[PDB]
Amino acid sequence: TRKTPNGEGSKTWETYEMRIHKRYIDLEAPVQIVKRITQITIEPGVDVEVVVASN
């Protein structure tokens, strides 16, 4: 973006970036441990996602 609200000056451009890091792990287990391991290990700001299946 240009730095100025208006239009005057040199045409200083800025640049903003936000860093999106993705990770995935696969596990085989029963239902009890998935449910145990997923309700806890909670962390604000990290997005946890747990799917299932082979398709």
Binding site: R2, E14, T15, Y16, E17, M18
Partner: peptide, 17 residues
């Protein structure tokens, strides 16, 4: 862009380079 710079923090867009 004038409110983007006044929020860029709270959204998560920062200034590395």
């Amino acid at each position: 862009r004038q409110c983007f710079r006044e929020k860029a923090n709270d959204i998560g867009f920062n200034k590395f380079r």
